[PDB]
Symmetry: C4
Subunit: 82 residues, 4 copies
RNA sequence: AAAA
């Protein structure tokens, strides 16, 4: 399949990481793709701490077809991947 | 199931990471959840070096139902996730 | 099998990481081998952000025999692993 | 089983990480255990770059009983885990 | 290596 990790701030700013196959989808892989987007500096994303993220992840785990995984950044956080 | 990683200092301070399913429970995933709690700064937790941690982990690996995994922080260490 | 991660800048500079078996080949393992090459400092590689990398990875996933995985570094990036 | 990662410098200095079960043994897990020993600071170990490490790892992967995995540190490197 |  394909799963596109999307960094999104309430701006409406998008950053679409290259897609990953559903076979590979996990929490580790999602933060793996984001780290690749941000580079050598470790990133900060407050929303990772919240339970939504884990629910939104289990949600896509149980879906059909190609999906898009949204990860919520502040307007300040999303400038790490710009 | 659910497994809640709990950061706990001898204060009695709790920090409950969002739960993870038993299917996903591992050492890598536990430090993964904690890192998400601490953010972009790598954390220090002395108790990770001790064999208790590994035993306490194998313990929960072999349990039934939803469990809670306690990770012991100094009173100073737990301020990383506060 | 064997899969040799090769860091390559348009110079034509090679850096060959020790090989990994196809059974172990993944995105996580590739960045794992590179990190081992670079050491304690987190590395920067711009090409990781691009979709080529993910395609070039799925490509080798679906191959026979021993392959070589090329990872494109700027001429400045490849000095991290030298 | 058990597999004890041992940091060893030519001094003869030992540092024994808590054991891991053979079911869990990998390159990722070995550097995972070492990181836990070193803490919040990323560690440097030159020997990780060499092919010996990968051979010495495949070696233990194909063994019976409980083994000990030796990781070679300079006399200066081993002070990271002391 | 906890995102390598
Ligand atoms: Na990792």
């Amino acid at each position: 399949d394909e799963i596109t990790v999307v960094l999104k701030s309430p701006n409406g700013k998008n950053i679409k990481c290259p897609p990953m196959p559903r076979k590979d989808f996990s929490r580790a892989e999602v933060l793996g793709y984001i780290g690749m987007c941000s580079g050598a500096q470790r990133f900060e994303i407050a929303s990772l701490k919240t339970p939504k993220f884990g629910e939104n992840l289990l949600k896509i785990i149980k879906s059909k077809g190609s999906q898009s995984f949204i990860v919520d950044c502040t307007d300040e956080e999303i400038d790490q991947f710009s």
